[PDB]
mmCIF file of C-alpha atoms and ligand atoms in Angstrom:
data_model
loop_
_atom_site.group_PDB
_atom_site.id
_atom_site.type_symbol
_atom_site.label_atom_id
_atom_site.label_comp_id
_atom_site.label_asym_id
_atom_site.label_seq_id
_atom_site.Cartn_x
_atom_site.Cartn_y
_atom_site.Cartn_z
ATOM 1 C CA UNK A 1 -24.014 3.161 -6.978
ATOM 2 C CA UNK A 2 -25.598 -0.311 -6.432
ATOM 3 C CA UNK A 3 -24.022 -1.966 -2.978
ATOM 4 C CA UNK A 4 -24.035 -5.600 -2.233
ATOM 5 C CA UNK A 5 -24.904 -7.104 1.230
ATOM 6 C CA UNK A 6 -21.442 -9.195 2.589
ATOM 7 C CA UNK A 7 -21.690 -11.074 5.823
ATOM 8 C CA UNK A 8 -18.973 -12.372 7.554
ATOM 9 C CA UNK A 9 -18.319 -14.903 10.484
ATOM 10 C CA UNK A 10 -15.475 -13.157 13.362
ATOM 11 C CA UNK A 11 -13.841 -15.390 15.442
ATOM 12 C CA UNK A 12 -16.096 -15.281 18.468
ATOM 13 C CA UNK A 13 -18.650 -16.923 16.181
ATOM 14 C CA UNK A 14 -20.924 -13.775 15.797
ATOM 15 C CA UNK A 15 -21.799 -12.674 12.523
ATOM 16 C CA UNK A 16 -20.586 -8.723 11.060
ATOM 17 C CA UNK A 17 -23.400 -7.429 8.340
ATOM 18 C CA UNK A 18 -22.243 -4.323 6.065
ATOM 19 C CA UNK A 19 -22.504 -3.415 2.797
ATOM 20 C CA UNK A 20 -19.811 -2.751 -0.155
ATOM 21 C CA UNK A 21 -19.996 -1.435 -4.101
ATOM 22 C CA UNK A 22 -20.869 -3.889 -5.521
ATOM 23 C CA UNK A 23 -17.017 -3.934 -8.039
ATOM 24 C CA UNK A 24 -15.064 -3.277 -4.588
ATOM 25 C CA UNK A 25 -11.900 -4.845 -4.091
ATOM 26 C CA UNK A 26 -11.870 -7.137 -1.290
ATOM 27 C CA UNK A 27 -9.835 -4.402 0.671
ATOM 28 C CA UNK A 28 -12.775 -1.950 1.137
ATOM 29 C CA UNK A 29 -14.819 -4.901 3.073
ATOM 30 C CA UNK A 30 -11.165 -5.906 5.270
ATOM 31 C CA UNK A 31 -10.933 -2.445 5.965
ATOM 32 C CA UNK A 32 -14.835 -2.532 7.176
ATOM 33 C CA UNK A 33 -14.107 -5.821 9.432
ATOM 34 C CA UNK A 34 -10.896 -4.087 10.966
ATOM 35 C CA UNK A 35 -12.173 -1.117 11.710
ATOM 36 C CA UNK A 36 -15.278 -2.886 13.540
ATOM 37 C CA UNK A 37 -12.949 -5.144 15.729
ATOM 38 C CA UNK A 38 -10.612 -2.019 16.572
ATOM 39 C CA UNK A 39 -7.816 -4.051 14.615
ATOM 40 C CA UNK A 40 -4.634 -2.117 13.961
ATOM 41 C CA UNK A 41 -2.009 -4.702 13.370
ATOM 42 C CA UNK A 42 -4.362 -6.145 10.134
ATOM 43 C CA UNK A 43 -1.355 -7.617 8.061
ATOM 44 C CA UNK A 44 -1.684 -10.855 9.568
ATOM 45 C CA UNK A 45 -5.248 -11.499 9.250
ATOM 46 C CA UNK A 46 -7.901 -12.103 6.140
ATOM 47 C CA UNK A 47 -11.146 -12.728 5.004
ATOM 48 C CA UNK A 48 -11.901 -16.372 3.678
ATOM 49 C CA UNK A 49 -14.482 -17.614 1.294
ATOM 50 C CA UNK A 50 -15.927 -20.471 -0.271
ATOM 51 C CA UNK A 51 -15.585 -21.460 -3.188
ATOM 52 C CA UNK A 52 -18.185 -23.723 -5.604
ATOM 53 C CA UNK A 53 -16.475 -26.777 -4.753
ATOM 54 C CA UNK A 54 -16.790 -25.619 -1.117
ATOM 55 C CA UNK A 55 -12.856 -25.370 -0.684
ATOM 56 C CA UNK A 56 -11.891 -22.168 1.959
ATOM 57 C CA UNK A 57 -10.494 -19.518 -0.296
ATOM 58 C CA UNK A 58 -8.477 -16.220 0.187
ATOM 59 C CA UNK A 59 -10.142 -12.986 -0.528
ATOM 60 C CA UNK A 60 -7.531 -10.947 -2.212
ATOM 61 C CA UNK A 61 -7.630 -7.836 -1.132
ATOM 62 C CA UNK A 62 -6.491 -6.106 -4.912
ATOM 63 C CA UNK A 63 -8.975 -8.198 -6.554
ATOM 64 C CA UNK A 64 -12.831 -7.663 -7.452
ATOM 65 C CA UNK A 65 -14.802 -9.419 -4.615
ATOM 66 C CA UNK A 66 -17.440 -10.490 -7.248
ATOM 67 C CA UNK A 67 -14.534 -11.829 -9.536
ATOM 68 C CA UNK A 68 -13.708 -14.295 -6.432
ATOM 69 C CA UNK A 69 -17.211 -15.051 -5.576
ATOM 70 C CA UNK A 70 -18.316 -15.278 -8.577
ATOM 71 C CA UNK A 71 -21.392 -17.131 -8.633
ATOM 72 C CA UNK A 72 -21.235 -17.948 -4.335
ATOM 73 C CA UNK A 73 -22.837 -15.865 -1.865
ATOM 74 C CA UNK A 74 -21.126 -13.030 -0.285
ATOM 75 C CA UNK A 75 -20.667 -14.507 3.023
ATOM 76 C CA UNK A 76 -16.940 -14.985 4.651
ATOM 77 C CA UNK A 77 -14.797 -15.675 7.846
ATOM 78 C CA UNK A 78 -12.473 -13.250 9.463
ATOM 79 C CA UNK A 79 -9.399 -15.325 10.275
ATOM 80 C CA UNK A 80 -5.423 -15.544 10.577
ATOM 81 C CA UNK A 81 -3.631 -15.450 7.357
ATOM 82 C CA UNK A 82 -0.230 -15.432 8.794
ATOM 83 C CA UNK A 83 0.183 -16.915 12.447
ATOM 84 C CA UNK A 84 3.785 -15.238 14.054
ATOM 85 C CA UNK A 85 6.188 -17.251 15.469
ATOM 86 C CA UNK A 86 6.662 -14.375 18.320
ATOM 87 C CA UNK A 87 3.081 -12.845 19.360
ATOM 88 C CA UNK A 88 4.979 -11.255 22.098
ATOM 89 C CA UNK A 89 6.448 -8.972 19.457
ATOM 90 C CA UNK A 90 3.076 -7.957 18.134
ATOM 91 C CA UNK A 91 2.536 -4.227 19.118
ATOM 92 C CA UNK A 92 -1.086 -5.209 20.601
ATOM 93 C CA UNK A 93 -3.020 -6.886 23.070
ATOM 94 C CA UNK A 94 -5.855 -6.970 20.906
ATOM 95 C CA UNK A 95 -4.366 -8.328 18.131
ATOM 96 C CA UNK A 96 -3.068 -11.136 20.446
ATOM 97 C CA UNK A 97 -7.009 -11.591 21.745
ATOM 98 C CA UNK A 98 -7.748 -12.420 18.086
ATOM 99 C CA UNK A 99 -5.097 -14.734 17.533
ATOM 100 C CA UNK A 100 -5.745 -16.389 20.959
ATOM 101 C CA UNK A 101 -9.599 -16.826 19.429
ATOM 102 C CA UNK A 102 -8.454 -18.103 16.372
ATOM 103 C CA UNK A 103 -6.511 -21.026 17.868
ATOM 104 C CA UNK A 104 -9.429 -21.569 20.120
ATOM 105 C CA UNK A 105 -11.292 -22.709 17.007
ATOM 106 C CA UNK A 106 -8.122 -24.456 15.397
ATOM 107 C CA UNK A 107 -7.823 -26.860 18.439
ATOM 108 C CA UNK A 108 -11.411 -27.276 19.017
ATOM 109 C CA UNK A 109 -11.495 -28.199 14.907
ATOM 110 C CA UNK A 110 -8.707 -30.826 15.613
ATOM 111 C CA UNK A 111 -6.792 -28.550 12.978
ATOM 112 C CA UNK A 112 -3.595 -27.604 15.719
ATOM 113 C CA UNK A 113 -3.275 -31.248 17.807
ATOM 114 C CA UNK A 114 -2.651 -30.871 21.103
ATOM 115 C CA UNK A 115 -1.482 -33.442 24.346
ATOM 116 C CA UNK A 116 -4.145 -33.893 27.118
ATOM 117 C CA UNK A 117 -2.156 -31.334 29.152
ATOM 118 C CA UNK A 118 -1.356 -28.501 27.303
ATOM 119 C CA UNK A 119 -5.653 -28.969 26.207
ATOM 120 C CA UNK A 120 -5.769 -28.481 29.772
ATOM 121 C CA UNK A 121 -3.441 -25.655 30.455
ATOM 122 C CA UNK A 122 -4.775 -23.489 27.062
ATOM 123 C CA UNK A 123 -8.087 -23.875 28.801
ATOM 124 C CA UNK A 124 -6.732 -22.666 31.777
ATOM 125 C CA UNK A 125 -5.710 -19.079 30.282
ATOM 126 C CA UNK A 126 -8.968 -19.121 28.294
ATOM 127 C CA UNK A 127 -11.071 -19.492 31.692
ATOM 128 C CA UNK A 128 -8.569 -17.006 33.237
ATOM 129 C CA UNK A 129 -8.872 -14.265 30.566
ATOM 130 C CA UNK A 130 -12.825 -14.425 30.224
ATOM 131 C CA UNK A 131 -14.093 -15.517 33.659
ATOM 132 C CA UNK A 132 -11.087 -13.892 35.995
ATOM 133 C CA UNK A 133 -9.711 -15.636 39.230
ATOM 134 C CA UNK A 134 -11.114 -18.896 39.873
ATOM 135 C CA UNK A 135 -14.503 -18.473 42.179
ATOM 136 C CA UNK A 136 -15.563 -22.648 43.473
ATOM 137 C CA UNK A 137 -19.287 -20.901 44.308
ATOM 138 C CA UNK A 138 -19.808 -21.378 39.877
ATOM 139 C CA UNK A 139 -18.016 -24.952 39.932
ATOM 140 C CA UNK A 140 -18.716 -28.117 41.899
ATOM 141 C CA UNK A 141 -17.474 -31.213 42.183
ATOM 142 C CA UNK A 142 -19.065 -32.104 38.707
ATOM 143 C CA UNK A 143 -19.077 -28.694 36.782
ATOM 144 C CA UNK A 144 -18.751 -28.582 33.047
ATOM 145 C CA UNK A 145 -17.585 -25.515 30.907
ATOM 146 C CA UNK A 146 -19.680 -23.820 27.883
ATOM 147 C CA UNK A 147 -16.206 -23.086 27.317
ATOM 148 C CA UNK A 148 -15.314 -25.682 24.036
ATOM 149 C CA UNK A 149 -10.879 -26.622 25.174
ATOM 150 C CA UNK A 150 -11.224 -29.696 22.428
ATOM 151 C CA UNK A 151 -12.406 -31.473 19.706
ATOM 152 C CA UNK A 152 -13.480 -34.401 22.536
ATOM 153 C CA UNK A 153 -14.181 -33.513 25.607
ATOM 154 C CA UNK A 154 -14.044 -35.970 28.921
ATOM 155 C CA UNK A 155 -14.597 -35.154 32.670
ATOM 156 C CA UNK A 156 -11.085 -35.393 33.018
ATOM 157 C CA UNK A 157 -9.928 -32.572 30.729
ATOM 158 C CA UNK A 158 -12.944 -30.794 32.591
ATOM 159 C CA UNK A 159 -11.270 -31.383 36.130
ATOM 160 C CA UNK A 160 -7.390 -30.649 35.010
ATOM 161 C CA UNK A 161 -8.709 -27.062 33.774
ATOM 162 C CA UNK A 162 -9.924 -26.348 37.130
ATOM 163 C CA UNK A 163 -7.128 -27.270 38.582
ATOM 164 C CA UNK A 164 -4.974 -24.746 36.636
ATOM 165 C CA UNK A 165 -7.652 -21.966 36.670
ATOM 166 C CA UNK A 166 -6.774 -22.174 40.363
ATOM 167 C CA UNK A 167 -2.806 -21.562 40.248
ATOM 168 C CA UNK A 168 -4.042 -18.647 38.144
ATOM 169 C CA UNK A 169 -5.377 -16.344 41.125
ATOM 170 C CA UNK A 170 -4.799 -12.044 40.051
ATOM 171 C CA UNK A 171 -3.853 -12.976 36.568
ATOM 172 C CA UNK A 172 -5.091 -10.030 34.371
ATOM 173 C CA UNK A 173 -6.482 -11.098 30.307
ATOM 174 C CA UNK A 174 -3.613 -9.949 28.631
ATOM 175 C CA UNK A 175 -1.458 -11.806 30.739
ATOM 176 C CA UNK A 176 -3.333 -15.147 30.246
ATOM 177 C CA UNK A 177 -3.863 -14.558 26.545
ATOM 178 C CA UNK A 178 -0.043 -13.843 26.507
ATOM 179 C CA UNK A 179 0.565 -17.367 28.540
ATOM 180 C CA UNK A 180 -1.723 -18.863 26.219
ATOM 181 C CA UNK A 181 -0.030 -18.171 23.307
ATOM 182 C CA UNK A 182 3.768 -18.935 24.896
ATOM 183 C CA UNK A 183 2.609 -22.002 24.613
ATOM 184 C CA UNK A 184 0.336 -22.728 21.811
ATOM 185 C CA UNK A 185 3.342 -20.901 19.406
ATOM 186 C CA UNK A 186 5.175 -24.329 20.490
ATOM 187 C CA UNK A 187 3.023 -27.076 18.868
ATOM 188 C CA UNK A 188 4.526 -28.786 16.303
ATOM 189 C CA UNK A 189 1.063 -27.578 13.586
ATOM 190 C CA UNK A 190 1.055 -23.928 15.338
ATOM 191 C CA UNK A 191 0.059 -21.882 11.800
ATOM 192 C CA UNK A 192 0.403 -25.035 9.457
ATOM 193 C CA UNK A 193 -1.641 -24.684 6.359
ATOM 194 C CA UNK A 194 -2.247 -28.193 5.569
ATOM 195 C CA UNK A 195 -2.933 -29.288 1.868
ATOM 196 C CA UNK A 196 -3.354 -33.223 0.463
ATOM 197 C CA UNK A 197 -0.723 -34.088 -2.390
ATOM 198 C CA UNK A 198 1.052 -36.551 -4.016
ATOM 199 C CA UNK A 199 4.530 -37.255 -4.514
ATOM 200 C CA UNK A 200 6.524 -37.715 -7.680
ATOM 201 C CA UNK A 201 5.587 -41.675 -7.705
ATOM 202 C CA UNK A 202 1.473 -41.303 -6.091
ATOM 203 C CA UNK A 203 2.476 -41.828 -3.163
ATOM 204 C CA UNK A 204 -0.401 -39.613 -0.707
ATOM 205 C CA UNK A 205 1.397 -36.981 1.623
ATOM 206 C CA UNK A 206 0.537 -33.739 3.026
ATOM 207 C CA UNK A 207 2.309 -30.323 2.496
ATOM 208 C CA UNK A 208 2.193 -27.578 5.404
ATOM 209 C CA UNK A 209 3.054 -24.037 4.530
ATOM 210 C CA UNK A 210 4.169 -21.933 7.714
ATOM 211 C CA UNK A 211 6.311 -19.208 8.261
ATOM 212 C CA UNK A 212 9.794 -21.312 8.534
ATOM 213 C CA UNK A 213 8.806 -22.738 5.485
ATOM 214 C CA UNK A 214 6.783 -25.808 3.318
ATOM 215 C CA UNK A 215 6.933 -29.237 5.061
ATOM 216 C CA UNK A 216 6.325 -32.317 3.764
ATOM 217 C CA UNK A 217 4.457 -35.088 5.959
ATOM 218 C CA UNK A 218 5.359 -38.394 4.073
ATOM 219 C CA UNK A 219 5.251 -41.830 6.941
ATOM 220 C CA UNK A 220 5.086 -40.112 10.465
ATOM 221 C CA UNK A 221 9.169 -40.844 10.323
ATOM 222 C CA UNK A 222 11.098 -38.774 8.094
ATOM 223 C CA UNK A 223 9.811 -35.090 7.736
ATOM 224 C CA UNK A 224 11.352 -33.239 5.015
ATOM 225 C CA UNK A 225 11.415 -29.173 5.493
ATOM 226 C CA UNK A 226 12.604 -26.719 3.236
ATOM 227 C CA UNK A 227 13.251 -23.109 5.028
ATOM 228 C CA UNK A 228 12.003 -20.400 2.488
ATOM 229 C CA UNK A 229 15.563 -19.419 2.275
ATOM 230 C CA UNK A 230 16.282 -22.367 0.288
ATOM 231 C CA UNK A 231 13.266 -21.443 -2.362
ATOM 232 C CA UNK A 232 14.169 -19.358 -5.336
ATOM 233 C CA UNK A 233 11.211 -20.869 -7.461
ATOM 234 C CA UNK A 234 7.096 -21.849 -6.954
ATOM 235 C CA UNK A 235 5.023 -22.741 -9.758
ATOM 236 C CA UNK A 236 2.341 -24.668 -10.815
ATOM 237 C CA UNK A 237 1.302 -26.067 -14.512
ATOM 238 C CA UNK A 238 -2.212 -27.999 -14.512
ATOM 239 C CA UNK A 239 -2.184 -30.253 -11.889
ATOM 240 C CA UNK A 240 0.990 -29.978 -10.907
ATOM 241 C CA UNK A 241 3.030 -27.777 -7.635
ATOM 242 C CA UNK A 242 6.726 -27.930 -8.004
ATOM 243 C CA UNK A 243 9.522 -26.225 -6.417
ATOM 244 C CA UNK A 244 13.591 -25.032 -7.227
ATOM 245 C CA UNK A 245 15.241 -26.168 -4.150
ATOM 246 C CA UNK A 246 18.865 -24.132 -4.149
ATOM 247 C CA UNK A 247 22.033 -26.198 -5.207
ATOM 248 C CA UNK A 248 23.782 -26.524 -1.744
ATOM 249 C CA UNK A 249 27.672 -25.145 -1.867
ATOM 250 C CA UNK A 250 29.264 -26.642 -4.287
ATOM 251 C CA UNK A 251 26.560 -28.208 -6.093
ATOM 252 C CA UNK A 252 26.306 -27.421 -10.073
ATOM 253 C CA UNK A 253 22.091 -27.240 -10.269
ATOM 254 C CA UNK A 254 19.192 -26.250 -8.051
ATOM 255 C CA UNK A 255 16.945 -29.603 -7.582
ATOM 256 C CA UNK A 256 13.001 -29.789 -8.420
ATOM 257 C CA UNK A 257 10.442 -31.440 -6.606
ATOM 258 C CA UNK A 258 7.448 -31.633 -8.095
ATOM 259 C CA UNK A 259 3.577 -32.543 -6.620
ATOM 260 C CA UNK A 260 -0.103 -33.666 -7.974
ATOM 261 C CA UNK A 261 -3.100 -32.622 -6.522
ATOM 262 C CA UNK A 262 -6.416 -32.728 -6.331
ATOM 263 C CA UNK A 263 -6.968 -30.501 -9.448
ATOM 264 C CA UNK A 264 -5.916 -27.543 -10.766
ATOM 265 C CA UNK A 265 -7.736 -24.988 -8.505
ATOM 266 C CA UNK A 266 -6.009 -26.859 -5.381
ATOM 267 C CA UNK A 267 -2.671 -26.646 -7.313
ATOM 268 C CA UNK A 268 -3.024 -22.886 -8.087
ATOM 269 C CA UNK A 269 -4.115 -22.562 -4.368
ATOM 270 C CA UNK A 270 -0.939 -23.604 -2.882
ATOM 271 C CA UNK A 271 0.748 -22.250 -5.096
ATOM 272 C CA UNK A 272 -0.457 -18.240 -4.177
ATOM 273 C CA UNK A 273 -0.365 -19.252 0.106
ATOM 274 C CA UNK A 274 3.366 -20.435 -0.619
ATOM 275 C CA UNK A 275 4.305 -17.174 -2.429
ATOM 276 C CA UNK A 276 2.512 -15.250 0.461
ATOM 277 C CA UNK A 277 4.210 -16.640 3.312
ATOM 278 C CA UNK A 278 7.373 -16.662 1.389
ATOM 279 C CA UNK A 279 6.789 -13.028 0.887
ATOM 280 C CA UNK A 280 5.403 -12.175 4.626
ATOM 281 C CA UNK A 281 8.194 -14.447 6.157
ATOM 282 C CA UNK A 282 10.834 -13.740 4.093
ATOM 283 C CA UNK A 283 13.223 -11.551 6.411
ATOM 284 C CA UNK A 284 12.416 -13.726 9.465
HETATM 285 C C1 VVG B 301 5.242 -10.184 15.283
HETATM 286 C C2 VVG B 301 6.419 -10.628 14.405
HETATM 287 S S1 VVG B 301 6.329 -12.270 13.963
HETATM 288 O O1 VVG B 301 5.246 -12.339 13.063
HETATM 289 O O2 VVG B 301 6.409 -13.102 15.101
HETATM 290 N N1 VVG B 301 7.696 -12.558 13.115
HETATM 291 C C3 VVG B 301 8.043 -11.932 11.888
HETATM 292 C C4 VVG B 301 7.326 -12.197 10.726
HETATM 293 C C5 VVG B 301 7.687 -11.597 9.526
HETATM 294 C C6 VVG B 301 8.773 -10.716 9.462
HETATM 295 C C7 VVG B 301 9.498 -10.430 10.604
HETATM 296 C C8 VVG B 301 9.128 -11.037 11.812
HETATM 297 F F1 VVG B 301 9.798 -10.729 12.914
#
């Protein structure tokens, strides 16, 4: 049985090495992951890839690896598929340390904006859950984190996180990690799966797939949302993303809205992370 060599990046930035068959589905390696992070509550997690025009992929987990790979290396991220609205209702406090290091890297990316305060406050929890109660014997006047809170950090962000840390005294890391995600689970990208599109007449927007449904980002005013609900139909055709959005009461037809993007690849993309989160989120 010949095995192939897959490495993947976890969210602490450290790198897992095993080995699968080299026809294994990309289950057998997310089972491998999982069971090295002690992960129980693995349904809302999943291993990305790379694909050759460099685009993050999801590894399906019925699928071949090598038939998603294809010709790319076998190297991946571990990372949150589908981001709940209520991590207080996950059964886990190690599931909610993942998620809490996930976000940690979206906000740091710039992918999950954030005001100057609630930077702050996130950080706060962070320093809380990893460092304990505040000790002023590690920090002076001019101290600087190895923590990363944002994608640009000042001395003032620096100073305001201190100043939390300290209100923080005999908090234990599942209580901060808890805190932290109260309020990261209120930003208006928390979980939003961004993807560049055009509209019906070229016009450039974005679409964001989360679990209350697919937005559409047009000119900052006016943001169209459609509550997956109100979906009965996702497909693409070349190019081309469009959905059925339901006849309201007492309307005759469903409506279609219809999208370009970038290629076809990008198209199908959407396409499958729609019909996911449709299917994940449905009964929410
Ligand atoms: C931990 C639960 S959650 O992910 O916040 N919300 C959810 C998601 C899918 C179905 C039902 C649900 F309640």
């Amino acid at each position: 049985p010949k095995s192939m060599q897959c490495k993947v990046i976890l969210l602490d930035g450290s790198e897992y090495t095993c080995d699968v068959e080299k026809r294994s589905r990309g289950q057998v390696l997310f089972d491998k992951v999982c069971e090295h992070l002690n992960l129980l509550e693995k349904d809302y997690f999943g291993l990305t890839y790379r694909d050759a025009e460099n685009q993050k992929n999801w590894l399906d987990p019925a699928k071949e690896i090598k038939k998603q790979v294809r010709s790319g290396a076998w190297h991946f991220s571990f990372n949150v598929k589908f981001y709940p609205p209520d991590p207080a209702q996950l059964s886990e406090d190690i599931t909610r340390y993942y998620l809490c290091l996930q976000l940690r890297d979206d906000i740091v990316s710039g992918r999950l904006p954030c005001s100057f305060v609630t930077l702050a406050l996130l950080g706060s929890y962070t320093v809380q859950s990893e460092l304990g109660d505040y000790d002023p014997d590690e920090c002076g006047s001019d101290y600087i984190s190895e923590f990363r809170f944002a994608p640009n950090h000042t001395k003032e962000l620096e100073d305001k996180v201190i100043e939390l840390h300290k209100s923080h005294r005999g908090m234990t890391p599942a209580e901060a990690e808890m805190h932290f995600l109260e309020n990261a689970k209120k930003l208006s990208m928390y979980g939003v799966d961004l993807h560049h599109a055009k509209d019906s007449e070229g016009v450039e927007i974005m679409l964001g797939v989360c679990a209350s449904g697919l937005l559409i980002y047009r000119d900052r005013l006016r943001i169209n949302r459609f509550a997956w609900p109100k979906v009965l139909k996702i497909s693409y055709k070349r190019n081309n993303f469009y959905i059925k959005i339901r006849p309201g009461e007492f309307e005759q037809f469903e409506s279609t809205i219809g999208f370009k993007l970038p290629n076809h690849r990008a198209a199908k993309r959407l396409w499958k992370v729609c019909v996911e989160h449709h299917t994940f989120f449905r009964l929410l």
